[PDB]
Amino acid sequence: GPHAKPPYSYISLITMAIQQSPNKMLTLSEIYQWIMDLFPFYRQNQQRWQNSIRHSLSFNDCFLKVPRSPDKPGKGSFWTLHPDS
DNA sequence: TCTTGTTTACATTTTG
DNA sequence: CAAAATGTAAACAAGA
DSSP, X not given: OOSOOOSOOHHHHXXXXXXXXXXXXXXXXXXXXXXXXXXXXXXXXXXXXXXHHHHHHHHOTTEEEEOOOSSSOOSSOEEEEOSOO
């Protein structure tokens, strides 16, 4: 590909996306979109890295996971940052 | 169904 | 390097 892999880890990409969000939380697709909008490199192999992103969210304890919900449902759950920074 | 999450198991890269 | 983090790959579960 014509573009270099951005110097940010998946954790850094997810973290930047959530912080810069107005609610300090994002959905899975919102994180997907954020990364792809900014970095053309991730407009390919989306099967691969989106899987690694989903893995990154479930693996790292710095990522919750906030129910929507009952009012305005509903796709997936919001992901945000643990106050432990 | 697909998308969204979780978990396992292994690889690869980064760093002290 | 060797340990520590990060990434890949695969399976299933859960749910709108």
